[PDB]
Amino acid sequence: YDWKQFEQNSKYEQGYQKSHPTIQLFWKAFHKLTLDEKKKFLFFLTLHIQKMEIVFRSPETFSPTSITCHNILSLPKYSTMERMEEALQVAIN
Amino acid sequence: DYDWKQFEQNSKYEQGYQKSHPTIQLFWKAFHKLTLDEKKKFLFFLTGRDRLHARGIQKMEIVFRSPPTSITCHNILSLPKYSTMERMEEALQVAINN
């Protein structure tokens, strides 16, 4: 249950750095949450986590006032039905 | 019955993709061919959610973006640039009380 490791795992995309003032506010607000609140936050976002990674992005770098979560699919530009079919089967672990 | 066509319509397309891109049409053709258990297994991989009843997938939303020759997925947090601790704490409470 190491929450420091969960923080260190975090990655930052456009608009943010680890040193950005809003990111430093988020992590202190997150660490002040009780354990049950932390879990409910991870449920809102998605245990044991210690290997989950969360990626931060500024709202203006997408297409506004509240926090939202997005499940992104990174899909390589496949040109065949057969390779696409095979790729889905591999994602189905 | 599961509302897979609505789930397809909820999709958004980001960096270098559109609903008419030929690879997207290849994806959905392949997606609508899996069994329900494979659709659910595929869903579990893209989110990790256990709530894949009919009402869950009907409101589910997937964002497509182009990249790595493997299919990968990420959870990204869209965080407004709040200025005060009091504002940040309030936004967390709104997020987990909904």
Swiss-Prot record, chain A:
Recorded coiled-coil stretches = none
In terms of superkingdom, the source organism counts as Eukaryota
Q: Where is the active site?
A: 69
Q: In which tissues is it expressed?
A: Detected in brain, heart, placenta and testis.
Q: Where is this chain's protein located in or outside the cell?
A: Cytoplasm, Cytosol
Function, in words: E3 ubiquitin-protein ligase which accepts ubiquitin from an E2 ubiquitin-conjugating enzyme in the form of a thioester and then directly transfers the ubiquitin to targeted substrates.
- Protein name as it appears in the record: Probable E3 ubiquitin-protein ligase HERC6
From which organism does this entry originate?
A: Homo sapiens (Human)
Lineage from the top down?
Eukaryota, Metazoa, Chordata, Craniata, Vertebrata
Q: List the gene name.
A: HERC6
**Shown portion of the whole protein?**
906 to 1009 of 1022
UniProtKB/Swiss-Prot annotation, chain B:
Name of protein: Probable E3 ubiquitin-protein ligase HERC6
- Give the annotated active site: 73 (glycyl thioester intermediate)
Q: Give the protein's function.
A: E3 ubiquitin-protein ligase which accepts ubiquitin from an E2 ubiquitin-conjugating enzyme in the form of a thioester and then directly transfers the ubiquitin to targeted substrates.
Tissue specificity statement from the Swiss-Prot or TrEMBL entry: Detected in brain, heart, placenta and testis.
Stretch forming the signal peptide: none
Q: Where in the cell is it found?
A: Cytoplasm, Cytosol
What gene name does this entry carry?
HERC6
